[PDB]
Ligand binder design. Structure first.
Ligand SMILES: NC(=O)c1ccc[n+]([C@@H]2O[C@H](COP(=O)([O-])OP(=O)(O)OC[C@H]3O[C@@H](n4cnc5c(N)ncnc54)[C@H](OP(=O)(O)O)[C@@H]3O)[C@@H](O)[C@H]2O)c1
Ligand SMILES: Nc1nc(N)c(OCCCOc2ccccc2CCC(=O)O)c(-c2ccccc2)n1
Length: 163
């Protein structure tokens, strides 16, 4: 079972300047809860974006997709394609694709679940932004209520599954 998990602004931004352009602690906690103990598959640019105490993501099998065969990624398994990432020698009940924009587009046709955090932050898109994938009519979802973070941002969680 392959799931995608991401956080986006309402406008569809997920990344800017090599990081994430808002602070939402409740969403980081959501991400940690859902992924702990499982495999997390990410693009190389997302691996480079992880802060020191989170690179590798503790308690999870980190898998990094790159075309650079020789890449040094201490604490992670380097593979050369998304399909490789999803064909482990040691199966996992739950595999999560955790970004970024390039990898989400490759993974979406292979996935059966998307766990999306929506962040009510006004972020008009900028030219180098990474953007969220779009879910079409093959996906159907349920939305949690709009919540307010202790830090101030409105947010809510959506759970989609392939029809
Ligand atoms: N808000 C969220 O939920 C969230 C989650 C994750 C990331 N982000 C943000 O999103 C941004 C990063 O996303 P991104 O789209 O720039 O990059 P990305 O998808 O993390 O990584 C792209 C890299 O993946 C590798 N790759 C892509 N397609 C491949 C293929 N077919 N075969 C093999 N390798 C392939 C390449 O690595 P090589 O160049 O090494 O070959 C490429 O440069 C950052 O801003 C990050 O902070 C946000
Ligand atoms: N919903 C949802 N899906 C995602 N795929 C996602 O990004 C995961 C990759 C970046 O992870 C980061 C980035 C910076 C700091 C810490 C971590 C991992 C910490 C840890 O779990 O140990 C996030 C997210 C995570 C953190 C901040 C904002 C959004 N949120």
């Amino acid at each position: 079972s392959v799931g995608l998990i991401w956080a986006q602004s309402t406008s569809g931004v997920i990344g800017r300047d090599g990081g994430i352009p808002w602070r939402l602690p409740e969403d980081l906690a959501h991400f940690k809860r859902l992924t702990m103990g499982h495999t997390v598959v990410m693009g190389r640019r997302t691996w480079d974006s992880l802060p020191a105490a989170h690179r590798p993501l503790p308690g999870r099998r980190n898998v990094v997709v790159t075309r650079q065969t020789g890449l040094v990624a201490h604490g992670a398994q380097v593979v050369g394609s998304l399909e490789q990432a999803l064909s482990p020698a040691e199966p996992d009940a739950a595999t999560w694709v955790i970004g970024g924009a390039q990898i989400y587009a490759l993974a979406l046709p292979l996935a059966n679940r998307c766990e999306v955090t929506e962040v009510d932050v006004d972020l008009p898109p900028e030219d180098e932004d990474a953007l969220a994938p779009v879910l079409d009519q093959t996906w159907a979802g349920t939305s949690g209520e709009w919540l307010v973070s202790r830090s101030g941002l409105r947010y809510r969680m959506h759970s989609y599954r392939r029809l």
